[model samples]
Target: ALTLKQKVGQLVMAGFNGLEASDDARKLITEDHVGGIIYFRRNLAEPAQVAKLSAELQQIAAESDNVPLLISIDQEGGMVTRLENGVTVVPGNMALGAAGDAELAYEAAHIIGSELRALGINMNFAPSLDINNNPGNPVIGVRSYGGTAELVARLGTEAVRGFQDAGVAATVKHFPGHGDTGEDSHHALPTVPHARERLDRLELAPFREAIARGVDAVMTAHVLFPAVEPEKLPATLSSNVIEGLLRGELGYDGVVVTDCLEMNAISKFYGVGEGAVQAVEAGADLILVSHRYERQKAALDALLAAVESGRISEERIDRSVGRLLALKQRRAVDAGAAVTLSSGDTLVTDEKTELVERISEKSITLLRSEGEFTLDKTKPVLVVWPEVRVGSEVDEVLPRKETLGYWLKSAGYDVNEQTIGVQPTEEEVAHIQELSGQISQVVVVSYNAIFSPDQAALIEALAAKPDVQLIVASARNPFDINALPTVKTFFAAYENTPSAMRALALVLTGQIAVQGTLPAPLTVTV
Candidate 1:
């Protein structure tokens, strides 16, 4: 019923705010024939609102030639889930990967997918398929399944199967690989400069395995892979990368969704308008404009014009359009025309919450030195959350004072606080010494060291004190502590979750056992 142009328009998936009026977003989908919508935390309110918004959005998309809109979300649990109101805080990929049980991973994925389907979500941009080889990896930390390619592949395949089995589409993401990039692609463009053969073992293996297992879609990474497609742009804008490497060589016929074009990595380099067109031309079946609607519209218009002017071949457009439409048709047949399902329950049982909490508790990996810190309840704890002030730009550390401070108090620890900005001067070390004199042990939550070198040096500085008994929690990356042979104890909490904090408090208080292992080898200590 749609013209080839409109069908190609459907191939472009854009994000929208649930806060935006239904009428406006509907017009974007209905008028422009957008195939889908991906929602983020900014748009979420509650379960009922989410359901109603999804219904309205789907209805609007239905008004166009497309039968059903693929309503997608980053519902991979842990810190990624945007549907917070009704869903459980599912353990993220790292926890699942660490569990070392394919069945557990499958169960977790099925549980997340069931909740998503209950809320009218059909697509999940999740189950990150990158082999997180870099311990100093800034962005793809515990969000990844594991450090090894085989573990990542197994877990990713199970996750995809779980989603599809539950009638929710799962997109294996940050492909052809984001795990090795030292920089966070969200803030900057990082390149993976490995030859094709080395990349196969270190990075691309997970994608290959995921493809073999029939992943529904593959999301392109913004990072440039100089070894694979040197002259072409990032995977999102490189036909040699997306179409040639992913689709042709790898034979991933699934939908190819681009990472957000609005990410600074892409936007800082190219205009969103041009980026969208280039991504589509680069063999991305779907262009994801995740954050800004203004930018999305600009990008959409650019793609539309490109198609009209023969700048982007219509045949190329048809390939992606057919895939998007085929997915919708499959969904329509599976679920029928009843786009929205009634809310079953508002509260995901406290049992599920406990499970999530337990998973977080289990994932706290202690990778430290020869001597473990012996916590005496009598000792005052000097908790210095190295206040990361990059230049005059001030950003509060995650698990803010309220969350971190409250947990320490709940544990009945006598704690002192100091915010030593990322680059602390000699005076700051004096302050640290002064603080250390009062406390029996010091815990510094540093992010990346090999990735953020200065942070590692701060930990080393504190460790210089013989009886300081430094405990380092690597929030994002653990590469920083790799060099410290004298540091008594280290914990990889992975990310800053309240549950992870609670688990850390328990560990500090000697309540739980350290269970996680370095899923990937660390050259720092090894």
Candidate 2:
């Protein structure tokens, strides 16, 4: 049995900086006795590096205490995935939703789970159960399965089963729901203002289904709901929301984990230590302080003090640690037994690659096209991409990575590429028009143009050209076509994965047929 201080330490799961386990990580797991560690892009290098790191952490946990550390990552396929080096990159939740197949959802989760276990990671923050009704939602766009409660419920349940069967604990996330809010919880705290009845119909439906399906964990969102808890704390710090609704109404006794406490949503208002104590008091079994070793220690110290002072009852801490221990007991890996590297055979097999391509072929939605605009290899082709921005502060539009431009160039077409932000400047608009006049056909690729007036204006400007053949390819959500209904050429690829982009290239070149339907409503209209 763990002492009170050791039990308090079990509530924390912190992230460390680097590809290997650092000295701080060693201290966190040994001296501080942290229950787990979470991985991000910084900790990733290649399969062997990740495998070795997971094994080392487990070894450290074994020597420090009897319980093995929970090695976790956000390996949700699509935009939020963490393992990029030599892993199967599948089209995310929305792509599966667009494909409208539950089996594919299960397969994606199974493949992701198997790959993580092979790398010695036992926990995954995935199968985002948030129903994506609000198209303007900044964070949970393609991360969600779909807008409908039934579809989200069905797909999410299957994913939960798939992950658990593969020996990886699946965490159904952002409870009650994060779908309706337009704000990003990473930047500003969001509030879901729906009435209780409305929440039951839409927001809470998938979570209810996931809990009933025996999910391993439920992650709390940083968003607040006035209807559930009028006391004004976000769900992360609300007893009424977490203990009352999720535990009482939803009847979920599984481990309740918080999203990163380091995110501005919680850290900006509450002191880091104060927030950690509050989250635990509110029924969060695991407190995630995902950055900065100082903050992790601060949280642990505060939690210990709270228990010693009798402000936080020892019974409360016991209940949380018991749940945490139960989950770890079932899923924790033995470092020596876990595989460190793949056999000579590839990790991402050709059949798995074909599965993603098949999904892409099924998910590439054709909304509107001017009866297949003919292509000429001799004429110039222009690919206009509305750049996708990532991160909270100090945002950067990263390299194009992979898109139709590369595939188009591969097929021997004269290609010119231009990237624009939310809105383009006058010079950019003029430059695009100049290219539009000279190109044989203009293929404008939109990520989230419905939210960007500049991209919408540029698309409208190019659409006005009578001689130019303007085709809009939506790379993220199908909602961009709603912003420009008059543009006759439009398609929804649902995601920007390389395979999906390749499927888009094939669809554009008349090599493949369009099959994907709108997963959500095409709401906006000109």
Candidate 3:
């Protein structure tokens, strides 16, 4: 039997900034009795380093009490992956939606799950169930499978089945759903004001199927669904949503995990300590405090105090801890216990890389093409690429030489590439125009430029030039085609992954047929 303090500690999952076991990680595991650790890009190095770090963390837990830490990562594929080296990079959910095959969704999840398990990561926050219906949605665009309920439900369910089949726990996230909101919960609170009827038709459909699929965990959204909870509390801190709607109505017996309580959605409105108590009270089994150590400790203390003060019952804490222990036991990890991974295991294999390539080839969507212009190997081709930015406001690009320029060059085309920021200056536009004049064809690659007037400006300027034959490639969303009406040729890769870039190269060179269908509405003319 565990004390109230120890049980409270088991409910909180904390994150640290180091790749290896730093002082912060050591304290969190040994002293604070944190039940799990979540990995971010900051904590990831190469595969070997990641394995060593995971082993070290588990070792720390074993030495302290035999409690194996539940090591987790947001390996959602596409733009949200954290495993940089020694892993197969696949196009994300939208790409899977474009391919429109449930088997591919299962295969991709299995590959991701297998690699994660080999790396000693037991949990993956993946297969985002949010429907991407809103075109102007700030986040959850490519992360979501599609706009329709049927597609998201079918594919998302298979994704859950696939992940658990490989021993890595898959979490379908942002319940009741974060699909229709324009604001990102990372930066601010997003309110989904739809009625129950509208939600049942679109947003909540996939999650319903995911729960039916017996997903290991369901992560709560920070967004407010006013139809479920009348107080307008974000789903993380609302019992009417989690306990009443999800647990009681939907009857999900699995663990309920909260999205990072440290996010602005929760932290900006309420204190971390208070929010932690509220979320746990609301039926969230795991309280995720992803960033700071001080906050994690504060949350743990708050939970302990709540139970001690009789505000939060010991039975509630025990129930949540029971769910955590059940998941760990299913994975053969004893309560407060960890197994040391062997160093000699083959982590990354050549077979997995090939599967990634095949999926990428299948997911290349040709939204619009005027005529089949010959892409000659001998002629110079200019690839005008926008500066790469992943999810969030971060400007960091994933480490891959397989951009539009790199892949084209590898395909034996004489490729000359010019990179531009969010908005290209007049001089930069002129230089690209000068380069275009020298080349027979120009490939303009945009990352959701329909949302950016400045990025769209560069496309308009280059296309308007005399005798400029331009082909636009949307590296993120197919929606970019609606913005550039002047450009006759348009391709949508749905993501900028290396595999996706290679697939685009193959399609451009007339090797592979365009097999992908638009997962969402492209020509909304917003």
Candidate 4:
């Protein structure tokens, strides 16, 4: 068993990568003694590099007498995935939720867990249980299942089963709900004031169902619920929220994981030192420091110091560590048992790729359409893209102009490229009017990421014309549609996966019949 100091160390998880492994990454493992590590897309290189990096971290954990390390990564699939080249993107919870096939959700997680175990990953912070009640809620659109609590509970529970079945610890997340909130918690903290009865009916139901299904971890949201706790402290720092509600009332005996503390939602509001101390006091078994090295170092020091100075109870740390250790032991045993199944690696090739494409194709939900999406070779459609220049925050992820345009052209669409960022302010409304007449129909693809003021402006401008047959490709979230109510036809690609892009074009060109309803609603700030 770990001493109090060592147990407290297990609560802190920092991001690390071999490719970008710096002095800070090494320090996170060696000096500060972080309990766990989380990986993102940027952390990935190739399979060998990933394995080497993960092994090195494990060696560090093995050296520790106190606690075993829980290496986690997001493998949610369809846009929000980060398993890199080895694992193909599967349809996310929304696709499963939209399909209304609980079995599919379970299977998706099982497959994902198998992949994680093969790569030596122990934890997956996934199966987003957020109910997608608000369509215009920028961050969690298709990231959530529909607004129905029962549906969310069913799908999330199935996913949890799959993860547990595959020997990976599954974390159902953003507790007290993130889907109904209108604002992005990344930029700022969202306040959720659901009545206690309402929370039971919706927000908390999925988590309760997930807990009953024996999910390994429950991640706290950064959102504030004033009605529940009567304080500004996020679930990350609220003792009442974590202990009183989750542990006491709801009886969640597993680990309580906090969302990334580095997000602006908390970082911008609370100091890292205070945040770390409060999180532990509030009953966070795992603290995730996703990005900043400085803040991560500070947070770790704060937690360790709190224990040494007798500010925080040793009993509290032990409670968390006990749960964390049980989780790690479970992973160790399961991974040990599945030593031979790694040979099934052949599935990574043709079979897996086909499965990925099929899932993407099936998930293309056609919301509303004006004219037939089928193209006439003679009358080519004009592709209007509201693009950001390279070197911007958005370009780093989507590579909107180059990649998307190439995909469209590859689909055999006669593309007329119009970069709205270049000719918007100085150009008049006639710019759109002139462009409108040039092509048979205008196919506008808005790269929705966060709150795009310029895109919002464009959405308003396009709404005024009303004649343009707008097919908004929601690369990220459908919330961008809030700015363009006049749009009659919209389609959610759910992700920017290469296969998903092809699937979109396939559906647009009448190759695949579009079916299914919105897994999430389409409203602004519900």
Q: How does each model score on lDDT?
A: 0.73, 0.84, 0.83, 0.72
Per-prediction tally of clashes: 0, 1, 6, 1
Residue lDDT tens for model 3, 185-276: 98898998878899878887889888876888999999988889999689999999999999999999888999998889999998799999
C-alpha lDDT (0 to 100) for residue 50 of candidate 3: 76
The TM-score between candidate 4 and the true structure equals 0.86
Q: Sorted by TM-score, highest first, which candidate order results?
A: 3, 2, 4, 1
What is the Å distance of residue 152 in model 3 from its true position?
Answer: 1.2
What are the TM-scores, per candidate, against the unseen true structure? 0.84, 0.93, 0.94, 0.86
Clashes of 2: 1
- Which 10 consecutive positions of candidate 3 have the poorest summed lDDT? 334-343
Residues 315-414, candidate 4, lDDT per residue (tens digit)? 8788888888788887783233323323224326677667656666777777666777665545667766554454222133333333345566887777
Models sorted by lDDT, best on top = 2, 3, 1, 4
Task: Give every collision pair in model 2.
Answer: 423-454
- Cα lDDT tens digits, model 2, 1-526, are 7877789888999999877789999989889989889998889778878887888888888887736888799888876677666788877898889889988899889988988888888999888998888887778878888889999999899999889889899999989899888798888989898789998898899999899879999999999899998976999999999999999999989999998898878999787899999999898999998889999999999999998888899889989989988898787555357464743323688988888888888888887775766456778889886665554321224344677888888877788978765467688788899988888499988877887788887898888889888888888767887789669888888777888888888888777788887787654111
Compared with the true structure, the alpha-carbon lDDT of candidate 2 equals 0.84
